[PDB]
Design a protein around this ligand. Structure first.
Ligand SMILES: Cc1cc2nc3c(=O)[nH]c(=O)nc-3n(C[C@H](O)[C@H](O)[C@H](O)COP(=O)(O)OP(=O)(O)OC[C@H]3O[C@@H](n4cnc5c(N)ncnc54)[C@H](O)[C@@H]3O)c2cc1C
Ligand SMILES: Cc1cc2nc3c(=O)[nH]c(=O)nc-3n(C[C@H](O)[C@H](O)[C@H](O)COP(=O)(O)OP(=O)(O)OC[C@H]3O[C@@H](n4cnc5c(N)ncnc54)[C@H](O)[C@@H]3O)c2cc1C
Ligand SMILES: [Cl-]
Ligand SMILES: [Cl-]
Ligand SMILES: [Mg+2]
Lengths: 299, 294
């Protein structure tokens, strides 16, 4: 029928750790901020979050909900559960078109839409993601309690992961024909106490048992993969933001002020070069939010 | 007593760093003197998840979560001297106690240095502040005084109308040049040039001639010093910023002295709790990585 027009100083696309941290700075600067969030955090798979001082061991859902409530306590902050499908530069800033068909208008944008894990094509793996199969050992290595750990090989980068893993438990480097250690490497692994298993993996079964092509089964307490990741949205590219290749996938380029190559568009969290954890998302999200405010004031 | 890492300073940056080292199953000791920079305010703001909580409760929660790891240790004390051995680092505390570590994380914070202005210091963290993102909102769009003190003061005053009607106070101690005069007027920032005798009531400025201007809050772009000379003792390169020195770090938060890392307000990109937690975590991970890969 009818509705009143709205205009936001900043719209934050993505409302998990990075976006909430950014939006909070803007809310505290008494500007109008909207978070549009599609409700699918990268960390929606594990039961606990670790490594963020003050939130260590808490449920990711509870951390997200507390942050949302704290932000929405500010009357100048608003939230929409929706997905931005198209971002357009306008004379008056930016227009966002969402999957619902709703449109929103902003002077500036903060991108905080996260990455999506692209898991190896291995039967049983995806079903155990965040339960017995993980990406980052600082996040989940401690809780393995010195047990048996499998490093699912995925190329050269898995070598360093294998070398690091004995900090947390008895490590087996399952190369899965993705990598063959040279002389130096084979010797460094042996010295580190890492066992190398070269046979192809057929599937993961039960909680965390690796079934090899030759029929062998090896039970693990946890498995790690250095998997690829992709940007969760084409919005950065739509806005003309420069995107660069990192070791494990693309990131949105940002400067010291978390600003992308497109003036007035900032980025934070996992989609930036130095993200990858909640602590970093909170930190650089705060930087992006303050930077976005400062541009509203000083251009 | 030998540790893999000793963290000097056990507030937000130190706890964040120590937590990564603890989670990496290494032996980490936090030595902390117990005087946080934010001990003066009743609430913290700006940290998602901790917004509006008392800084004391935030720090206590962090200490509890860190000490849940039996490989983390805590000592309330002050490190007075740090020495490099080839066998690591040796620390001497005010208590006389010695400690040894393969690596160090400096997280001892900075100390604010306020102008000698009668009434100002006792209102610090209550109605006199440094950071408007931290404490501007609660002034509820009322009147704000910015205490002038050099180039950064002008920029602060230019930003402050976001939070309320702003007055730039020179305290009769310098005149803005006409460039700065011009843009301030072009923001609705009044310049008051009178000598200030004292601060009274909440944040009321009382002039030498007795007249009063009632503000809801005052801001200062004050200088800061490093809390401790330990960074200098260890040969860590230190840079002067506009408002005070900071310990130089690279991308992994490592100082110029290998095996010594730094985080929090003592580094160039600190100044808030969100940043202390973020770069603390980096420093802790980096310290661990160096333990493993050298
Ligand atoms: C299994 C697992 C366990 C982990 N455990 C930990 C841990 O214990 N500790 C830790 O520090 N890190 C952990 N991580 C890392 C972690 O999850 C990230 O670093 C963190 O979530 C990133 O924050 P973010 O705000 O950048 O992105 P995200 O948390 O992924 O959130 C992005 C948000 O943007 C929304 N989005 C995407 N597209 C759109 C769109 N077009 N419009 C609107 N919204 C959109 C999403 O739905 C989502 O809600 C873990 C990761 C995984 C995979
Ligand atoms: C009044 C005020 C209000 C603020 N409000 C906010 C806010 O709302 N939100 C926000 O994000 N930031 C706020 N800040 C900023 C804030 O306090 C810092 O960003 C934060 O405290 C820095 O953390 P830190 O761990 O680096 O250092 P600190 O918190 O200063 O802690 C350093 C610790 O190291 C210890 N130390 C010093 N020397 C030694 C030694 N020789 N041996 C052992 N230990 C030592 C100290 O005693 C201290 O406990 C505020 C600051 C002030 C002044
Ligand atoms: Cl993970
Ligand atoms: Cl402050
Ligand atoms: Mg956590």
């Amino acid at each position: 029928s009818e509705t009143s027009p709205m205009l936001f100083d900043v719209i934050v696309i993505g409302g998990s750790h990075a976006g909430q941290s950014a939006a909070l700075q803007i809310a505290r600067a008494r500007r109008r901020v909207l978070v549009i969030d599609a409700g699918a955090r990268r960390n929606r798979f594990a039961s606990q979050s670790h490594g963020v001082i003050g939130q260590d061991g808490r449920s990711p859902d509870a951390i997200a909900a507390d942050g949302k409530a704290q932000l929405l306590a500010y009357p100048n902050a608003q939230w929409r559960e929706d997905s931005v499908v198209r971002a357009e530069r306008s004379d008056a800033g930016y227009t966002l078109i969402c999957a619902s068909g709703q449109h929103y208008r902003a002077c500036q944008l903060v991108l905080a839409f996260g990455v999506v894990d692209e898991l190896p094509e291995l039967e049983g793996l995806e079903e155990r993601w965040g339960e017995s199969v993980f990406h980052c050992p600082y996040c989940h290595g401690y809780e393995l309690d010195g047990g048996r750990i499998g490093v699912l090989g995925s190329g050269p980068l898995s070598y360093l992961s294998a070398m690091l893993m004995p900090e947390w438990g008895q490590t087996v480097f399952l190369t899965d024909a993705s990598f063959e250690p040279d002389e130096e490497q084979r010797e460094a692994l042996a010295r580190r106490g890492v066992e190398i298993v070269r046979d192809r993996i057929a599937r993961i079964v039960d909680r965390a048992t690796v079934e090899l092509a030759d029929g062998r089964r090896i039970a693990f307490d946890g498995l790690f993969t250095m998997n690829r990741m992709r940007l969760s949205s084409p919005v950065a590219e739509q806005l003309g933001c420069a995107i660069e290749e990192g070791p494990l996938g693309p990131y949105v380029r940002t400067d010291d002020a978390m600003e992308t190559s497109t003036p007035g568009v900032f980025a934070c969290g996992d989609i930036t070069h130095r993200g990858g954890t909640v602590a970093l998302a909170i930190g650089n999200g705060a930087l992006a939010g303050i930077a976005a405010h400062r541009k509203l004031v000083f251009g």
